[PDB]
């Protein structure tokens, strides 16, 4: 199953404060508009390479 | 370059005296420009007062001349100009000698006299003439006999205030229409950012703050990693200087132009 | 200073730039988050094998 | 805690997320930091520093001279000038005289004037001062005359005279010339 | 002054933006230019024969 | 070791020479444009009138 990732994935890249500036960053980011794999927990989890960090987005209501 | 360190200036009276020539360009470029625009502006010798009546045949002008409502003696046109267009690190900015009051006021004083003294106030001294014999004169001046104006005064006068408050309109409503203005100052502006962010450079070193560097290391090394900072660092003020000179030259060479434009252009008739 | 610096033992009417100045710092300061806290050496330093 | 600085310590109003530790705002230049031991958020401001000058009407007329900091305020004088920075003997100087303050900076030895004259020691701002005791007053730009308009009279001259007038103008320099090896 | 090789890249990675502020000139110098012929040249509003 | 010693110098030289030229060649150049104005204004103001 294959979804579009719109925009999602950007995270602050270090701990400095700024105001109102542009900042140009380049390092480890998930490409816009992109393809994401979907998984349904019936009759699963297989194991998966992890080749530089991973994403993981999670929108279970039951714990 | 350092932020005042003494191994700076121990290593740096081994280089010569270039900051003595630098400090010599900045000053006469700024002596220069201060004496342009004061021989730009500085061609009366007097002050003249427009009189309270005013009735020029007709013509308006209002949105022109100076009025005293204002805190900064502004005129309409120059209020809407001036609404349009829109830092310690070792440099600072020296203020103009002539503030912008005395700019209106040399404006004012040369409007009022090309107004009322017609031209003869450039050579001479202020001589009363009525407006319309002076657009007499001229139109007899641009080859059209002073037997036209006399007889479509009315429809002149209509054609003038008609035109101004046109070009008012256009003004206030048009933009982009100040171009090279904003042009120097956003260039201005993005050359000093750039000469303020290139500080921040390795330059080839092991660090970019000196202090640090200097209080962790073994001084034989010290010396080689203070050498290519301190020569990285002279090479981009001497770009930035060089830059600085350009601009000053072809600023000068346009104020120039401006100046015999308005000596001749304004004070008699081309 | 002014002689100095234009070296002569003259001067005519005008304003010279001679030098600058700067205030100088008082003391120093320095912070540490709240406590400190021993690491174990020993176990490193003195273990069974 | 490691980020060493110089500068002038000042309470911020500015806010944090939980998770920073000290603030910018251009070119590598830390301006806010907070306290770990109270989490209080403060702010450097570089400490006061300008450029010197000295307005003097001549050695030839006299020997007395007036001192300009640029780009500093009064309170910061007295503090600048003591016994131990910029010749501690002109700490005298830091004192009695008459402290005028101007929008290009500070003013020592100087008198203050409510008249306006047309003077040539340019100062800024549109002060400027002059011998006179040293006294430093406003711009005056000229004379001011008022002419009597009235849309039916003239004004005609019955004599000439002529003048003669010099101008100088430059149209060439030295020619010189530099060798490679014989430097 | 790399010759496409990396190794120069990263070397002159270190020496700061000299690299944008060469580019620049050029092309204000080239836009000048071309505005230099245009104002010479166009000072008519039609075409006559 | 006289080798580093005699590149540290002849760069230096280098440098100050350049710097020298290229104040020469500002000032040539203004002073260029001033000699050009002072060619007409005389060839406009003595040889006719203004
Ligand atoms: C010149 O034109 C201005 C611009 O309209 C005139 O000023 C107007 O005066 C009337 C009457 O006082 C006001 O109601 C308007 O608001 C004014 N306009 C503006 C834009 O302020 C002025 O009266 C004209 N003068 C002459 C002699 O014609
Ligand atoms: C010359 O042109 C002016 C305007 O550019 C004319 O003045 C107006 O003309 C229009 C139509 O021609 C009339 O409706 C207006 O009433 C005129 N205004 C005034 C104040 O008279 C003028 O008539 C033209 N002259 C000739 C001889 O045609
Ligand atoms: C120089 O320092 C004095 C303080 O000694 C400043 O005076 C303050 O000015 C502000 C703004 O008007 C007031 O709110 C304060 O109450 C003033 N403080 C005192 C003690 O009077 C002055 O503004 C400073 N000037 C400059 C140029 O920095
Ligand atoms: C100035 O022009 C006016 C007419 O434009 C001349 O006559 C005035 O006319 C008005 C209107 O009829 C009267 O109210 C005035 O009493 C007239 N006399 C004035 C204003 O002095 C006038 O003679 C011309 N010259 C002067 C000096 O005003
Ligand atoms: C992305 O997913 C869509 C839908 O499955 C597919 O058509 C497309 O080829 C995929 N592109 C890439 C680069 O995986
Ligand atoms: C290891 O034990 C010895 C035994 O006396 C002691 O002297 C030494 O300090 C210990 N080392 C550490 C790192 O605690
Ligand atoms: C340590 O933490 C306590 C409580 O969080 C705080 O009150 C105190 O100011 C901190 N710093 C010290 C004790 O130096
Ligand atoms: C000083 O100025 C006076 C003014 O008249 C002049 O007579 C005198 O020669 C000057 N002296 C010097 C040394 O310049
Ligand atoms: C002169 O100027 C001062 C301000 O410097 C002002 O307080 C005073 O009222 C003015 N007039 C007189 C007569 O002193």
New binding site residues.
Partial sequence: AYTNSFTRGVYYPDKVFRSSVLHSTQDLFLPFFSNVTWFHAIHDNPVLPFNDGVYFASTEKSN | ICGDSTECSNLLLQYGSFCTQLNRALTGIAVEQDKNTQEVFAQVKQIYKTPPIKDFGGFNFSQILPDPSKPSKRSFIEDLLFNKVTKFNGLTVLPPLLTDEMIAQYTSALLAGTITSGWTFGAGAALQIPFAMQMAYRFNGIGVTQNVLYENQKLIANQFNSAIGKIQDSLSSTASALGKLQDVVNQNAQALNTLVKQLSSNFGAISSVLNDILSRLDPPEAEVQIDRLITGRLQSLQTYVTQQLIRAAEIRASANLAATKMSECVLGQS | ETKCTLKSFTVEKGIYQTSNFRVQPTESIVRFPNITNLCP??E???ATR | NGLTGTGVLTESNKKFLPFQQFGRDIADTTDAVRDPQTLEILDITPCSFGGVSVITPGTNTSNQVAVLYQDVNCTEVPVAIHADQLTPTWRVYSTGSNVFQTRAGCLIGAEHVNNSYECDIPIGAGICASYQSIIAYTMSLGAENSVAYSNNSIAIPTNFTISVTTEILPVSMTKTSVDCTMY
């Fill in positions: 050496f020993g490193v330093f003195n």
